[PDB]
Amino acid sequence: ENLYFQGSGRRLVLPVSARTSGALRGQAHALARRLEERPGLRLDDVAGALRADRPALRHRLTVSASSVPEAVEALRAAVPAVPPVPDEPPKVAFLLPGGGTQYVGMGSGLYRENDVYRDTVDRCAAVLRPALGSDLRTALFEEVEPGSTAAFMALFVTEYALARTLMEEGVRPDALIGHSLGEYTAACLAGVMEIDEALPVVAERIRLIASSGGATVGVAACADTVLPLLGEGLSLAAVNSPVACTVAGDTDAVDRLEAELTRRGVPFRRLRMPAAAHSHVLDPILESFAGHLRTLTLRPPRIPYVTNVTGDWATDAQATDVGHWVDHTRRTVRFADGIAALWERERPVLVEIGPGDSLTKLARARLDGEGPVTVTTMRHAKAQAADGFVLAEALGRLWSAGVDAALPH
């Protein structure tokens, strides 16, 4: 179970582009039949030849392979999966999850294969030791108490390292959106905050939220259905999509809401973190948390980002205002509105940065049926794919949608 650096391995992305719906499938089986019938062809050479010796036409797909049999098999199954590329290159947005999908071992494959990912994690763990009290890489890769400060900081650093890794490949986001904790990651990526200063502040934000107690319930219904059921002792914590919102408050009030939701057939699930972020339960720690926010050098965003406060693009005045960041922690996460504002300006490819597809589902629900292209970037806890495979697929898919710099080499 070693995390020693191995460097990049043999896995490569093979690009295929045609002019038709259409000929793409045919051209992919052609290439498959060529590598079978030509044992002298190395995967190595084919990857470069597919890059240098052919034009990048409108209809694209890719396969990932660490060997010729793998590539041949993947080119048969290959089905076009994104629309033909636009006449103008697509915009790109990063979506940064707030927690719920973190796990021990996430990104461990990237930690071993990718020097940017490894260096970013190492840098953050060293900066974090005085505030955290431990080496974050222990929590990232070996063991962690669920819902601890370390568990969530593991998620924050994974997002940051993964975003830095994509940016070094040339996939630089034109816009950012995060969900609660993820808005801090977005602010660091946008230049609003410096990662080294943000790390201890995010850590104390987590401890202050956890120490405030209370409870949160995720309700699979739109906010209009939930609002009339609240509720002295309850706040609307997040409006996530037309079929998802969260409600937070003291545990007794949340218990009674759940009883009344059951009585109406409304599906819901108690979030496992016994906390109440984005609700009145945080009132006693807001001013203390503003003390920590005052330690940060805030700058206007150099990449645009939408905040959960307004569900709209953050202004320079907001990004640099401690009181806004205090409001961000107290007030409803307007994620669904944020997704719509992001989409309406850019119509960008939506790239989820972090483990899972939880924000991708919210975006698909809110953006039905604008046909968003979404890209996923890190596997769920129980999935068997290798991290480097999932990353290579994401990069190939980004190229297929028209983000040319996403293709590696």
Domain boundaries, the chain: 1-90+383-409, 91-212+276-382, 213-275
Q: Determine the 3-state secondary structure of 280 from DSSP.
A: helix
- The Cα 15–Cα 36 span in angstroms is 18
Type of residue numbered 10 = R
Q: Which CATH class is domain 91-212+276-382?
A: alpha beta
- The Cα 389–Cα 372 span in angstroms is 23
Q: Judge if 91-212+276-382 and 213-275 fold alike in CATH terms.
A: no
Q: Determine the 3-state secondary structure of 51 from DSSP.
A: helix
- The Cα 204–Cα 285 span in angstroms is 11
Query: Residue 395: left (phi > 0), alpha (psi -120 to 50), or beta?
Result: alpha
The method recorded for this entry reads X-ray
- The Cα 307–Cα 302 span in angstroms is 14
Answer for the pair 261, 247: CB distance below 8 angstroms, yes or no: no
- The Cα 77–Cα 63 span in angstroms is 10
Q: What is the third-level CATH fold of 213-275?
A: Alpha-Beta Plaits (3.30.70)
- The Cα 6–Cα 219 span in angstroms is 43
Nearest Cα neighbor of 165 from 361, 1, 398 is 398
Half-sphere exposure of 386 (CA within 13 A, CB side): 15
Nearest Cα neighbor of 49 from 66, 35, 70, 29 is 35
Q: Where are the beta strands (DSSP E) in 280-389?
A: 305-307, 312-313, 349-352, 374-375
> Cβ–Cβ contacts within 10 Å for residue 250, how many?
17
Name the CA dihedral angle for 85, 344, 247, 144, rounded to a multiple of 10 degrees: 40
Whole-number Cα distances in Å, 81 to 20, 85, 408 = 13, 12, 19
Contacts of 88 by beta carbon, 8 Å cutoff, 6+ apart: none
Half-sphere exposure of 256 (CA within 13 A, CB side): 10
First to last CA, the chain: 29
> Cβ–Cβ contacts within 10 Å for residue 289, how many?
21
What is the stated resolution of the deposited model, in angstroms? Answer: 2.4
- The Cα 402–Cα 409 span in angstroms is 17
Q: Where are the beta strands (DSSP E) in 333-400?
A: 349-352, 374-375
Nearest Cα neighbor of 374 from 355, 356, 397 is 397
